[PDB]
Design an enzyme around this catalytic site. Sequence first.
Site, mmCIF file in Angstrom:
data_model
loop_
_atom_site.group_PDB
_atom_site.id
_atom_site.type_symbol
_atom_site.label_atom_id
_atom_site.label_comp_id
_atom_site.label_asym_id
_atom_site.label_seq_id
_atom_site.Cartn_x
_atom_site.Cartn_y
_atom_site.Cartn_z
ATOM 1 N N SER A 174 0.239 7.150 3.948
ATOM 2 C CA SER A 174 0.369 6.170 5.038
ATOM 3 C C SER A 174 1.060 6.727 6.302
ATOM 4 C CB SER A 174 0.985 4.852 4.554
ATOM 5 O OG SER A 174 2.392 4.915 4.546
ATOM 6 N N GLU A 206 -7.416 -0.310 0.074
ATOM 7 C CA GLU A 206 -6.325 -0.053 0.987
ATOM 8 C C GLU A 206 -5.601 -1.336 1.430
ATOM 9 O OE1 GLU A 206 -4.909 2.538 1.792
ATOM 10 O OE2 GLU A 206 -6.253 4.216 1.345
ATOM 11 N N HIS A 239 -2.975 0.419 -1.793
ATOM 12 C CA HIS A 239 -2.300 1.385 -0.929
ATOM 13 C C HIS A 239 -1.120 2.032 -1.661
ATOM 14 C CE1 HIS A 239 -1.809 3.047 3.041
ATOM 15 N NE2 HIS A 239 -0.580 2.581 3.194
HETATM 16 C C1 LIG Z 1 3.872 3.568 2.104
HETATM 17 C C2 LIG Z 1 4.192 3.207 0.688
HETATM 18 N N1 LIG Z 1 4.005 1.798 0.339
HETATM 19 C C3 LIG Z 1 3.070 1.607 -0.776
HETATM 20 C C4 LIG Z 1 2.040 0.522 -0.618
HETATM 21 C C5 LIG Z 1 5.277 1.059 0.192
HETATM 22 C C6 LIG Z 1 5.406 -0.255 0.909
HETATM 23 N N2 LIG Z 1 5.705 -0.181 2.341
HETATM 24 S S1 LIG Z 1 4.373 -0.654 3.293
HETATM 25 O O1 LIG Z 1 4.430 -0.057 4.589
HETATM 26 O O2 LIG Z 1 3.122 -0.103 2.847
HETATM 27 C C7 LIG Z 1 4.246 -2.398 3.349
HETATM 28 C C8 LIG Z 1 3.748 -3.070 2.225
HETATM 29 C C9 LIG Z 1 3.626 -4.461 2.233
HETATM 30 C C10 LIG Z 1 3.997 -5.190 3.363
HETATM 31 C C11 LIG Z 1 4.492 -4.521 4.499
HETATM 32 C C12 LIG Z 1 4.876 -5.336 5.716
HETATM 33 F F1 LIG Z 1 5.174 -4.516 6.721
HETATM 34 F F2 LIG Z 1 3.851 -6.123 6.104
HETATM 35 F F3 LIG Z 1 5.961 -6.058 5.383
HETATM 36 C C13 LIG Z 1 4.619 -3.124 4.482
#
Ligand SMILES: CCN(CC)CCNS(=O)(=O)c1cccc(C(F)(F)F)c1
Lengths: 533, 536
Positions: free
Chosen positions: B203, B329, B442
């Site tokens: 990401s 994703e 994701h």
């Molecule tokens: C990059 C690693 N991930 C794995 C999926 C951990 C979760 N953080 S996020 O950015 O991917 C994420 C995940 C869910 C919600 C939000 C929000 F910003 F909308 F709050 C952010």
Amino acid sequence: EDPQLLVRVRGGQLRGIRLKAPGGPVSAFLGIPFAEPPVGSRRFMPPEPKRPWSGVLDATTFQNVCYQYVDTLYPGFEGTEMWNPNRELSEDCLYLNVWTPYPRPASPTPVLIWIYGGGFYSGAASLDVYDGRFLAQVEGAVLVSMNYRVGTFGFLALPGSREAPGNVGLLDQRLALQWVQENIAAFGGDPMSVTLFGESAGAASVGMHILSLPSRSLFHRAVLQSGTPNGPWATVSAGEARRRATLLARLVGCAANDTELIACLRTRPAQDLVDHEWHVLPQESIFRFSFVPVVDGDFLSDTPEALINTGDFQDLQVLVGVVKDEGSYFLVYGVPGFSKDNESLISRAQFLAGVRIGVPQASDLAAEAVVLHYTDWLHPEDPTHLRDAMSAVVGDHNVVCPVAQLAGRLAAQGARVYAYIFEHRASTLTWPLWMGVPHGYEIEFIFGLPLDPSLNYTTEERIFAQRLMKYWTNFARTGDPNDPRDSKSPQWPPYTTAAQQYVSLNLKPLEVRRGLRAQTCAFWNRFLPKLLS
Amino acid sequence: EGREDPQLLVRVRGGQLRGIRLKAPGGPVSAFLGIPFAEPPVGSRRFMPPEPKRPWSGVLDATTFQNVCYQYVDTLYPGFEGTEMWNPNRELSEDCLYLNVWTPYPRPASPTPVLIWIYGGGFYSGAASLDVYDGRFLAQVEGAVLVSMNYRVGTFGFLALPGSREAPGNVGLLDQRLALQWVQENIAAFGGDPMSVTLFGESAGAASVGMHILSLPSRSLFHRAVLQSGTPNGPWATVSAGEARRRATLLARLVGCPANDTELIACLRTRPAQDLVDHEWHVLPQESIFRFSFVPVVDGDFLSDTPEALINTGDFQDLQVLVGVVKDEGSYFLVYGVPGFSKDNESLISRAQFLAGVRIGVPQASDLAAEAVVLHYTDWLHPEDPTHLRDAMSAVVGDHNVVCPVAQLAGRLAAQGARVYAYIFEHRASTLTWPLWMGVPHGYEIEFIFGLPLDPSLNYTTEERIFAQRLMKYWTNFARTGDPNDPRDSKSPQWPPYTTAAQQYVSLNLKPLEVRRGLRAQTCAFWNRFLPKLLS
Ligand SMILES: CCN(CC)CCNS(=O)(=O)c1cccc(C(F)(F)F)c1
Ligand SMILES: CCN(CC)CCNS(=O)(=O)c1cccc(C(F)(F)F)c1
Ligand SMILES: CCN(CC)CCNS(=O)(=O)c1cccc(C(F)(F)F)c1
Ligand SMILES: *[C@@H]1O[C@H](CO)[C@@H](O)[C@H](O)[C@H]1NC(C)=O
């Protein structure tokens, strides 16, 4: 004389002719006048019912073809000629034709009434493709076909003028409809069971009769093949009609009053009008026609779209359909890089060039939308895909999606709908293979031509033609194309909004499919309009 | 020293380190943890570009993980592993610039290719210390030297008043660049090869990698790139200078911070870190998902023009990049915002809920652009089916944010000289703790690439171990050679490069490699080609 060939109708006596169909004789009555010849000062005017006559009028031969442009792109070529006029051209063309079994039916027979196509600018009931003998003979149908005024003579309108109010070609049809009500019983036909069918411009007239109250009492069922009242080509606005009329008049030399203008037009030889017929289009287009029905708030209260969007079709029954390659035919007629004499493989560029033509109204962005949608992003420059895409665009734009739209509208609003797609390419078709199943090549099968032993069709097709004549007539008889004694095949289900079932018409028995280009027609019927609104 | 392990004592430009011998399934590894590579970005250095760490005296104990960079912590689903595993696992502090190193044990004798990992987490979160980023397996099993590093997130890493001296923007990216510099000076002391350095990340980490490719000063610090489920181009990875200023200013007000930018920043520097975090999510222009408050700014400095501009017009002959996505994703984001969606039910939504969801999932779309989106993802045979709608909603979010940007990236890179390898990762973990409807969400490729299924105590299946191993081979082969394939296992299915001509890419799952053509080609023509015209 032969009793089975003498008929007294409301206007006098007729003498038909006995014709030999493959399987037996049929009684035919050709060249029956249904109106006073709309010539001279009667040009552009609504039709008047034909005056009575003395003696026995000879109705054993095809009358003249309404005055129209004749195609000359491939002179002497069966694929184009089969649509050209096969009788002399005359403004004196208001005549109809009735075929019936011989001996004429004992009990009241359901009536088929055919309305030809030709983009409202050409066509004739005398075409071999429209030969009614086979249906009459094989299915014992009573079948009727009329000539109606095409081009400037049938659809030149100065809306709101007394001397050229437009839609008179459709009035010509409406009047033959009346004639059939008043007279058909005499031939054994059942005025209480009249199905209309038609293709291309014809399918749209059918639709326009559905949509015009004065007509809803002259028929009980409709079949619209490869054409609809809605859509980009079948109507113009009053302002657009007025525009072209005025433009034409200028083009032959006529700048003042409605009455004065039309007066001058009336004094113009037919060929002069046709000489310019084409010059009044607003854009370099295809699948566009100069003089078509006009939204006058008379024959058509409103636009077909408004009308189908809110009509009540509680008591209607309709057969609607397309062919596999609705667009192909049109491309060879001025779309750069197309021809019937080569496989017409095109570049991306010609593909863009060609979209601005098959969608003349489209904005820059609207066109880009089309291009992006029909490009195969796996083979964005593949010449075969690009060619086949160009056809699809033109076919979907002008036929498939408008039809999908009508089916959806009708079904949703009470109508009982049957939808087909016709997928069989004629064995003796003279167009190249790349055009597939072009616009208008289901007709020969519906009309039963393959039974003509000398037309050199295969047996499979003979059997196939017979299957369609059944569908079509079972429809005429019942409002349902399904044999009530069949039997194979899986049964043809009604089109609905939920399931959206139609069937493929090909050599194999019926197969049911769901969704009539649902995704692609969503784009045409739902998104593009926003894009221009 | 004298009685310690002579194999856990190394020297770096900053001084002496003592690392730790860890156990992995197959044997011991050397680990050096919490190696400081920058001066603590605290007090009056908050918001400032990192200063290189000043040498220390004595042997620094490098046996445990350091502090996690100050960040918002997820509370949506309390005590649920699905979320917890991404939450910081060491104390939160602005003093957090530390890197980690894992190597074979004993350290290699010949120079070893180096893998540098960069965590994602939206730029609002992330730590190199999470279990899922454990280099112990890649190190032990493939002989890799693995480097992972902390970098400032949120306001602290990316809040910018563009043009100013006190908050130039992108310092988060600069922290990373500093760690890459660190590797170039020091990695040979651990047996790593600085002539052979491969970035990878997922990401925002992936986006980060993209951004170094795109940023001239970074392009001598590494030789090859991996981009997992992220890109520097796209809707969420960057903001204009105007918009960054807009949000910086807004945050200031929310916290009482009303020599113009100087006064403003100075005040912010006086706020507890926790008050900054508590207000981070309020500066977003629209109700949304897959948007984050403080991301890299296009400054005409770290980023000379926009990523989109740069990939369109670059020359990438020398670049070997491996990119790809997961099957689903978008699923993960829906339960954090789209009414209708939850991990605790099957989330069957209505058409109404879908239209409402599309506005949220595509926050920057005009009414007309949203119609377009909704008409594309609608199945017009079943436009009201709750299950289809649920999955279209997931696909809008996934396509818009990852799958199509990644598609856009591979396309432009290949067309412009670069060796690209593309994949889709289709295997849901038998251990996954999210509901089935989310597919392969994701981030759930990571555990497999790092080789966690080899941890016997993690209850993965035998297939999954073989599989995890295959994937390490790919990654680590690509690192070595720029090509993920094996010269010795030559009979196994090959992984062809992605090319504009054939758009080939492989499926990654329990079955042997399958080659496919076209990254959601048609649907990406929509997002990548049409939609931009719809507004241009
Ligand atoms: C990059 C690693 N991930 C794995 C999926 C951990 C979760 N953080 S996020 O950015 O991917 C994420 C995940 C869910 C919600 C939000 C929000 F910003 F909308 F709050 C952010
Ligand atoms: C049913 C369709 N066909 C085939 C049997 C009917 C006859 N061909 S024609 O009328 O269209 C016709 C009549 C005269 C000349 C020519 C031409 F060959 F020169 F084109 C064609
Ligand atoms: C009754 C069915 N068709 C035959 C398929 C008749 C003539 N084709 S058209 O009018 O529908 C048509 C077809 C192609 C070009 C043009 C032209 F106007 F550009 F010349 C017209
Ligand atoms: C793994 O499996 C065992 C039972 O076989 C169980 O007791 C243990 O708690 C499990 N651990 C995890 C990580 O789920």
